[PDB]
């Protein structure tokens, strides 16, 4: 009914409010952008969104982002002249983020060249409070990009190409962030989103069709970025897959509140995400690339290939770690679920809103846990498929030592109950018999 | 066709319940299909009602499969998907039984031979194929239920072959 009233006025009220949100002054602009952000969210019809696009206000708002490069340069100062600009920027990025959540909105933003304009901004290359502020800029920009494209339609795949162009245009800053040994959850989120974007954008099919006008070189640049992504992705196994896991989880125990608990939860999220995406990427590369099947060169005795064995050892070790943690997280989630309306009454003996917030915290727990679940399901699957075909190939073509190590670890895979609650929530068991067939091919191969 | 399908899918994404609106849009199509063709061959009409249900069931199955397990928002859509499946299979049942009962009424016209020299089963059944108004129909119910189970591909089958190769 509210939308019918907004329409009823005609494109007249929408034009005046949207124009004033663009270039009014300070407060009014911020509030007008917030209002636009809120109205576009309840725009099921998406009429307001159509008007903004047809009247050119959306383009003006996107063009106005180039204005903040000078503001950011002035802000990196110890003393800030006015935080008003930061709030306008936030309202603006919030509104754009809302528009990007729409399947169509993401397309319209891509038509308007939002990623191209972000790629031209030099503020992203000025990595130094000031460091926190660079951090926040990065946050909004990258935000919009990733969210958009991801929630973006399958037809708009170039989204991945444009985002990759953005990552490559700022390769120094991105590599610096991927090399930063930071236990902060934020850094993990940055890494999770970036690894997700790289997993979808860095398809060797995008580098071959990019040779039409950029040509022999654009391919090398593409291969170069991909090779870096590969090395940085493998380095993550030593950080998150080694004895340093306990130190990252212990330095945050000097102070663990509900906040710290959830932080660790999403640290696990990252661990999960950053790589599910990377594993997906590996699987996709193998199914299309097929692991250099055409090449007859021995895979096992510039890069190195024991790297594969290391990765195998590491992934086999990480699997058990992830599995134990996943199982522990599920128990905590079950305990949180146990708590009823009766628990709120016991607390009262506000207790009710304590339970409102309690439910909040516990459902955040649920989120993180289920996330972890899917993550590890996928992890297992990947390890398997890979190792399976790997050893298939190896067979014909060291083998005794590998087989002995494999048999010992495989027995020790005990859990060796593979579970069935995530599986009972998910559809059919592709961990069961698909994994069982993988075991017949591999454990039997080890035998 | 790809532009019209994208616009309709995008319009339904603006409705507060895409499942309820997808059920409502079929009401005129069901009436139209009932009216359209002649009374003498309604069957083709029922086969078209089944096809219309199957089209929306296929769409709703794609929607329900894309949803992350645990959103209470899709419980109503999953119930409507089941009810539309029940509608589709009820049309299939009506087509099978009313064709067959109608077939006996307008076709058991020819006849007639009592017993056979052979004790062979085939000859006994060919002679008694006409003669039972209960049996034939019981086998049509079996064939109908076997057709439902055939449509219902539980499909780990190929991966089940992967699960245990002939070996």
């Amino acid at each position: 009914d509210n939308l019918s009233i907004f329409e009823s006025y005609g494109t007249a009220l929408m034009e005046v409010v949207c124009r004033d949100a663009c270039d009014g002054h300070d407060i009014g602009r911020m509030l007008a952008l917030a209002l636009l952000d809120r109205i576009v969210s309840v725009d099921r019809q998406q009429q307001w969104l159509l008007y903004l696009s047809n009247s050119g206000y959306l383009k003006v708002l996107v063009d106005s982002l180039a204005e903040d490069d000078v503001v950011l340069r002035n802000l990196l100062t110890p003393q800030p002249p006015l935080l008003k600009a930061l709030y306008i920027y936030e309202s603006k990025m919030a509104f754009l983020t809302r528009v990007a959540k729409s399947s169509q909105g993401a397309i319209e933003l891509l038509r308007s060249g939002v990623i191209v304009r972000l790629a031209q901004c030099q503020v992203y290359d000025m990595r130094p409070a000031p460091v926190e502020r660079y951090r926040q800029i990065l946050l909004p920009a990258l935000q919009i990009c990733q969210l958009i494209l991801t929630s973006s339609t399958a037809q708009h795949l170039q989204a991945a190409g444009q985002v990759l162009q953005f990552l490559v245009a700022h390769s120094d800053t991105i590599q610096a962030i991927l090399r930063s040994q930071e236990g902060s959850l934020g850094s993990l989120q940055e890494l999770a989103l970036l690894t997700g974007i790289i997993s979808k954008a860095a398809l060797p099919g995008v580098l071959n069709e990019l040779d039409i006008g950029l040509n022999d070189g654009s391919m090398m640049e593409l291969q170069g970025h991909i090779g870096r992504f590969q090395r940085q992705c493998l380095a993550l196994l030593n950080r998150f897959g080694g004895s340093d896991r306990l130190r990252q989880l212990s330095l945050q125990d000097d102070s663990s509140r509900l906040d710290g608990v959830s932080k660790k939860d999403d640290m696990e999220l990252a661990m999960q995400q950053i790589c599910s995406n990377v594993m997906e990427y590996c699987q996709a590369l193998m199914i299309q690339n097929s692991p250099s099947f055409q090449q007859t060169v021995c895979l096992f005795t510039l890069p190195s290939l024991g790297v594969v064995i290391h990765l195998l050892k590491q992934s086999a070790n990480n699997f058990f770690t992830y599995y134990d943690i996943h199982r522990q997280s599920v128990g905590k989630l079950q305990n949180v679920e146990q708590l009823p309306p009766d628990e709120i009454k016991e607390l009262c003996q506000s207790t009710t809103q304590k339970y409102g917030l309690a439910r909040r915290r516990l459902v955040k727990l649920i989120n993180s846990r289920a996330k972890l679940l899917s993550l590890c399901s996928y992890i297992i699957e990947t390890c398997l498929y890979i190792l399976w075909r790997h050893l298939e190939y190896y067979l014909l073509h060291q083998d005794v030592d590998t087989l002995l190590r494999e048999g010992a670890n495989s027995f020790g895979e005990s859990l060796q109950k593979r579970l069935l609650d995530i599986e009972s929530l998910y559809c059919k068991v592709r961990s069961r018999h698909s994994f069982i067939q993988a075991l017949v091919r591999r454990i039997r191969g080890l035998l | 066709s790809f532009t019209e399908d994208i616009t309709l899918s995008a319009v339904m994404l603006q409705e507060e319940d895409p499942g309820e609106a997808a059920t409502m849009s079929m009401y005129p199509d069901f009436l139209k299909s009932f009216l359209e063709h002649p009374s003498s061959a309604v069957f083709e009409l029922i086969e078209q009602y089944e096809a219309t249900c199957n089209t929306q069931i296929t769409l709703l199955k794609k929607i329900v499969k894309r949803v992350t397990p645990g959103q209470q928002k899709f419980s109503k859509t999953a119930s409507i998907l089941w009810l539309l499946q029940q509608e589709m299979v009820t049309w299939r049942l009506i087509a099978a039984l009313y064709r067959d009962r109608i077939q006996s009424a307008l076709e058991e016209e020819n006849m007639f031979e009592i017993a056979a020299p052979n004790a062979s089963e085939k000859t006994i059944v060919d002679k008694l194929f006409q003669r039972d108004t209960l049996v034939r129909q019981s086998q049509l119910v079996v064939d109908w239920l076997e057709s439902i189970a055939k449509d219902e591909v539980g499909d780990f089958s190929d991966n089940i072959e992967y699960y245990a190769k002939s070996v």
């Binding site: 997906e280 199914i287 996928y378 | 991966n159």
Partner: peptide
């Protein structure tokens, strides 16, 4: 959605 797509691919395998 990505996890669901991977599960569907595994089922197809």
């Amino acid at each position: 959605e990505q996890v669901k797509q991977r599960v569907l691919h595994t089922l197809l395998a």
